Design a protein around this ligand. Sequence first.
Ligand code: ZN
Ligand code: ZN
Ligand code: ZN
Lengths: 124, 260, 115, 67, 46
Amino acid sequence: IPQIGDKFASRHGQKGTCGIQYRQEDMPFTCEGITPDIIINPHAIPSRMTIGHLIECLQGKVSANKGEIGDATPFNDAVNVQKISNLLSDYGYHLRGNEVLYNGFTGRKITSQIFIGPTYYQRL
Amino acid sequence: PYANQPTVRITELTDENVKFIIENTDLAVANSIRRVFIAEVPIIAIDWVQIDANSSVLHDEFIAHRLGLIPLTSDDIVDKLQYSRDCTCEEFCPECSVEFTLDVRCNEDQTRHVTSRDLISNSPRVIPVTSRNEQDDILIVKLRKGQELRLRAYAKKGFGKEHAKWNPTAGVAFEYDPDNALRHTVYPKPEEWPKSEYSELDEDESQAPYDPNGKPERFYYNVESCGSLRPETIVLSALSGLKKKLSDLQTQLSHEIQSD
Amino acid sequence: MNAPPAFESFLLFEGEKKITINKDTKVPNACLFTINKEDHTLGNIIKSQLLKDPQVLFAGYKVPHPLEHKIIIRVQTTPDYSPQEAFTNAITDLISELSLLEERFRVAIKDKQEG
Amino acid sequence: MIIPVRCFTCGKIVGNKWEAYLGLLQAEYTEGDALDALGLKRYCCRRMLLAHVDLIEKLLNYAPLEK
Amino acid sequence: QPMIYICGECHTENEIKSRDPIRCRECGYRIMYKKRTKRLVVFDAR
Ligand SMILES: [Zn+2]
Ligand SMILES: [Zn+2]
Ligand SMILES: [Zn+2]
């Protein structure tokens, strides 16, 4: 059973161990009570420049809301971020994949709208 | 220095969810109610399995874990049953547990779907939700000709703090201040964000004018039930459980104050 | 290997007190309530109810470690008042609020099912 | 290998929807319309049904250990 | 005492004693599997 110290990775070089596990009432939630399965730190993105992670998260939100499988083939001019954002704005979501989350401990809104969505993770 | 006088307004009540609004309460009370929906509303769930025979392609712990997550109707029985911690019996008794039996064998050529309908209980009140008298039955395992699964489960009383299988909710939507009047969020581009279903704003207006003297009131809830409890039973049991947590805390507080 | 049982978040160990009151010596009329086997669910409501008392000068809580299963609530009141009395009144007020909320939710459910 | 019982995120039951989902797909529903027919409105449960790979059907191609 | 095994190919329940070559009596297959114990193993459905 996964636990603190088990190594997980996305498909973009974003590896890390489980720091802690919070129950569903302790995790942050959207207005429709969706809690993240995983929370990763924003500081893993900028130096690494794994923008594929973010585009995959956004495409995955579109895919899950649309009932399809996203096409992430490398060199495809028929798929860019603006198209994916326009598609996501049609399902009642912020076009860039952000959502207002609430603090699970206090229930107050988090001032900064969080970037959340489906991403394929791997257990190593 | 005294309590709130909250009011309630239920805007939708089905067998699947309850959508309501609590007004004139603190955000901490609203979020503790929301948390108790998930983590301190007891229900009945399988928490003990004895596999007598399993020739299926899923190992024993797979089947056991899978049985634990089947919701069992807990409406009137959960209040009566005791925690096995509190029961003065041996490992089990009908006062703290419910016995289930499952015995399936695939003799025919087509795949046999061992579903929650095959979980036979000794208690008629505590049965799998899908088996209750549409939605199909939860699939425990598929069996091939010659494969067989025979087990004996016991279901216990617990809540979501111990394991998510004792969580009665299939999602708790919680919201407040749909128009960002308290500015607890700060949209870099307020025009880009969709409107809440509870918003009262004309489409040209993106968010409400900032309310400096405002406090979070009017919390909107949509408590979806996994099936074990009715959604309104989830809310009532949540309020009762939170009140008994506070009552026990006050009892222990009084003992500590008087002992000093 | 090192996984604590899930009940350890809710259940008191033998000989472990649910709540302990310790006088805070830094400032007068302040106390620390160390409550075992509770979490943000009760801490947040108790703190926020204590903040509604004008005789309460400080009301805060913390979970010192998420892996541990206790909370500490610090309460400072005015000299004519007591932090123990403030904590008691906060719990009483929360109980009354929840009782009223429960009765009103029962009434609302009855209205919704009937008409 | 088999359809999960609950949605990992919310805890909604999805175990009883795999067979209905497949029956809707052979009924010439799109995956989105099929997921709408089963009442999976949160994209977490849509993720559960839409990304599931029924490996148990391949594990049932092997004869069991006992006849 | 009997230690009945199952055949990997013919799935036949056959008894084999110690100091005996591992051979199924029904088809001669050389790989055998032990049967599930009768002991009582308990699972917390978690
Ligand atoms: Zn008992
Ligand atoms: Zn879900
Ligand atoms: Zn043989």
